Amino acid sequence: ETPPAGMQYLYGSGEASALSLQAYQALLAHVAAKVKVRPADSVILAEGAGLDDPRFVPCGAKPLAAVFDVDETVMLNIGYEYHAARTGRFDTAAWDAWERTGEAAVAPVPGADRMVRALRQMGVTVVFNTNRAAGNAEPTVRAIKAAGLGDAVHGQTLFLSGDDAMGSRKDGRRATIAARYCVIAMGGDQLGDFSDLFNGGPSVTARRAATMQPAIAQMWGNGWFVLPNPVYGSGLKGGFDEVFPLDKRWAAP
Amino acid sequence: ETPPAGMQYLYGSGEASALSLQAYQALLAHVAAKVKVRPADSVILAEGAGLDDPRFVPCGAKPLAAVFDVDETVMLNIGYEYHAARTGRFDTAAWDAWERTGEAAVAPVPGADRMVRALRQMGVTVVFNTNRAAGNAEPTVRAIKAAGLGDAVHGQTLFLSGDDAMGSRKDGRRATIAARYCVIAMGGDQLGDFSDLFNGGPSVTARRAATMQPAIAQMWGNGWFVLPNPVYGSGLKGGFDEVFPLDKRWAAP
Numbered sequence: 001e002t003p004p005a006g007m008q009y010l011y012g013s014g015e016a017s018a019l020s021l022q023a024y025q026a027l028l029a030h031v032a033a034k035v036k037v038r039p040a041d042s043v044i045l046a047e048g049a050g051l052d053d054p055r056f057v058p059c060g061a062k063p064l065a066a067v068f069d070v071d072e073t074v075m076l077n078i079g080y081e082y083h084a085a086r087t088g089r090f091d092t093a094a095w096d097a098w099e100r101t102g103e104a105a106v107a108p109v110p111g112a113d114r115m116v117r118a119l120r121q122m123g124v125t126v127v128f129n130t131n132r133a134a135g136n137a138e139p140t141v142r143a144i145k146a147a148g149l150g151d152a153v154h155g156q157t158l159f160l161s162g163d164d165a166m167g168s169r170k171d172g173r174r175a176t177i178a179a180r181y182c183v184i185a186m187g188g189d190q191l192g193d194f195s196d197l198f199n200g201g202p203s204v205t206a207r208r209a210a211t212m213q214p215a216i217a218q219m220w221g222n223g224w225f226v227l228p229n230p231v232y233g234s235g236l237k238g239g240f241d242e243v244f245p246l247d248k249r250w251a252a253p
Numbered sequence: 254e255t256p257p258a259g260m261q262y263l264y265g266s267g268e269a270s271a272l273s274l275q276a277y278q279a280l281l282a283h284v285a286a287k288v289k290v291r292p293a294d295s296v297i298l299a300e301g302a303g304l305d306d307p308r309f310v311p312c313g314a315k316p317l318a319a320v321f322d323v324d325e326t327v328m329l330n331i332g333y334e335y336h337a338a339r340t341g342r343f344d345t346a347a348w349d350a351w352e353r354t355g356e357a358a359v360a361p362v363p364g365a366d367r368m369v370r371a372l373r374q375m376g377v378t379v380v381f382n383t384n385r386a387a388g389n390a391e392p393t394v395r396a397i398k399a400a401g402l403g404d405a406v407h408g409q410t411l412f413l414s415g416d417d418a419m420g421s422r423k424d425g426r427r428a429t430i431a432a433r434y435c436v437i438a439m440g441g442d443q444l445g446d447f448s449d450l451f452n453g454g455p456s457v458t459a460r461r462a463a464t465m466q467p468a469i470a471q472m473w474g475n476g477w478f479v480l481p482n483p484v485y486g487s488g489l490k491g492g493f494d495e496v497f498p499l500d501k502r503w504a505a506p
């Protein structure tokens with residue numbers, strides 16, 4: 001009669017709350033310095049830049065902005081994950097219904113409503129880039145509002161799956177955002193919220209090593225801001241040999 | 254044939270690696286400012302200060318230090334958790350054996366070995382406060398060393414369960430550390446690594462609310478630094494009514 005451990009941690013624990021408040025505290029102080037001293041590089045990778053040699057879209061004189069994934073980055077999908085725990089169901093038809101009717105069972109990630117208000121008081125535009133469907137743009141706007149995250153506008157501050165022909169790949173939308181804003185901070189909970197190059201090929205152990213590539217490792221808490229998600233997605237993969245390296249194994253007596 | 258989801262995330266994913274590098278990046282920049290401008294308050298709560306009215310031990314002119322929990326804060330216990338996933342076993346006799354023989358199956362939390370080296374290059378003493386047993390101080394010293402975390406000394410930079418008569422409660426050891434150092438940063442993965450007042454009474458929902466108390470919320474990423482642990486401990490508690498609030502519930506059609 002107890003929910004899955006990952007949901008206990010993410011939705012129930014003070015540990016996960018404190019972890020989330022830490023990320024937004026670091027984001028806010030990073031944005032503050034970039035508002036006082038505008039950078040030369042934005043936080044979005046340039047097209048053609050690989051994970052083995054990263055390079056970024058220039059900041060120029062474009063208006064300052066911050067980009068956020070929606071689900072489990074700024075908004076907790078409590079209603080849907082409650083259904084998953086009750087049912088045991090990955091059901092795409094249930095999630096499509098959730099995208100349309102879930103606006104009254106969402107909550108802000110701890111500190112996300114304060115963080116969004118402070119960014120707008122600093123003159124920084126808040127842009128959402130999410131893989132919710134374009135056809136559900138309006139209920140998504142209402143759910144973001146009910147979570148205390150402000151007013152999103154499709155095509156200006158809200159970009160959805162199907163706005164282009166790239167599907168779940170977010171690089172296209174990131175390039176569109178970077179072409180009109182100078183993004184000084186980007187938040188996410190899965191690595192695809194920072195670059196599609198983490199996905200569509202690399203193995204579980206390769207993706208983990210890629211985060212420690214020196215030009216990439218410098219971004220974490222310093223441009224790229226991460227929130228916890230041990231409940232679903234690209235972080236919950238791999239067999240025994242990819243989770244526990246063979247030189248670090250041990251047996252009880 | 255796949256490990257538990259929480260271990261997939263924590264030990265296998267790039268998401269958890271990036272989350273950990275973000276915490277240490279924020280810690281390093283926080284310590285840098287406190288070395289340039291010594292604060293008046295240390296980061297350890299004073300005795301008698303409650304979570305409803307926090308107050309801290311003064312910094313004074315004491316040497317600067319940073320305090321870390323060991324397990325899943327700076328050191329990953331890969332060997333033991335591999336055994337848990339293989340077995341399904343919470344076995345105190347197996348963990349006691351792990352405390353004595355696990356020095357060759359540990360790894361640093363991503364960024365922890367670099368973070369520890371940088372702190373010592375800045376002149377900041379690295380102090381470990383862990384609930385491993387006092388009688389296992391020497392194999393614990395060797396495991397910390399094999400994880401690339403430097404040289405710990407029992408009673409000077411390493412404080413263990415049983416060093417006083419308080420058991421798993423860490424407040425006593427924190428007061429001893431704060432009496433001789435000015436702790437400018439403290440890292441942990443469970444709330445008991447910051448104050449015993451989060452435990453020994455408060456419910457799952459109360460502990461989560463306590464992290465958002467205003468004087469407490471300001472500490473996260475700004476003195477108190479958190480690392481992820483969805484595998485075991487005080488973050489994996491609660492029934493359905495404590496994980497999913499009743500005003501945020503939803504049912505698929």
Ligand SMILES: [Mg+2]
Nearest residue numbers: 069071072189
């Ligand atoms: Mg997400």
Ligand SMILES: [Mg+2]
Nearest residue numbers: 322324325442
């Ligand atoms: Mg720990």
